[model samples]
Target: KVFGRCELAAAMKRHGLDNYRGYSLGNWVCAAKFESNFNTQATNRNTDGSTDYGILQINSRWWCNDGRTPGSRNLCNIPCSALLSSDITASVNCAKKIVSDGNGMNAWVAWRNRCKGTDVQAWIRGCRL
Candidate 1:
């Protein structure tokens, strides 16, 4: 239960948001909850021998070179187990850097907009952070 808030807040912070007040974190929490059941230590295997890891479900193989060094293969060279051990902020930040060159929050905002809809309050309730 606690990991829910930690992951959500960390995700928001990584996106450069200062606060979760006004249902911002809430919406993310909801979406992440629905998507991953609040599992920070989650992982998924792809047919291509890759893996998605952590609260935000980032793919470690996509970012790791040899599963030992940081930013060796890509940006998140740390092991997937280690990636999910902490809050989602670092993973999310790393993902943002990889995908958008540090501007991936725009993608997040777009995702939230599409999923949460126009009703901010409803979005918060459904996706509470």
Candidate 2:
């Protein structure tokens, strides 16, 4: 399902992304907007032959196994296809793991280029949460 800003923020917050690892809900919301524009089926192929999947754009290089990415660790231990589904449980779960890694939100270039050093609160401005 495609998600509106508030809808995506609320959904992500409900699943414990509000301040997971000290990153605010605004950070999560803003990053997600740039990552997939809230599209559940979004995918982006990396030059490395790995693919980024789903709303948070979880990558196949180390996070999920797509059976195509070379040297995939499948750190999330689920099919990469799981991220493409409307259900975002796996995506969020894998994202939490991604942020928990050394890169944190820096794992997403979109976040660094767009969300970092910005007024991310604007991303959730109209949202009640």
Using TM-score, give the best candidate's number.
2
Which segments of candidate 1 are over 4 A away from where they belong? 5-11, 14-31, 65-72, 99-129
Name the lDDT of candidate 1. Answer: 0.52
Model 1 residue 116 lDDT? 59
TM-score for each of the candidates:
0.55, 0.96
lDDT of 1 by residue, 7-68 (tens): 46555655764333333554554445544556777777656667666655565545644364
Candidate 2 backbone clash number: 0
Q: Report the C-alpha lDDT of model 2 over 1-129, residue by residue, as the tens digit.
A: 899999989988999999999989999999989999999999999888988899998889898989998778999999999999988888889999999998789999999999987998888898877
Separate clash counts for every candidate:
3, 0
Worst 10 residues of 1 by lDDT: 102-111
Worst 10 residues of 2 by lDDT: 120-129
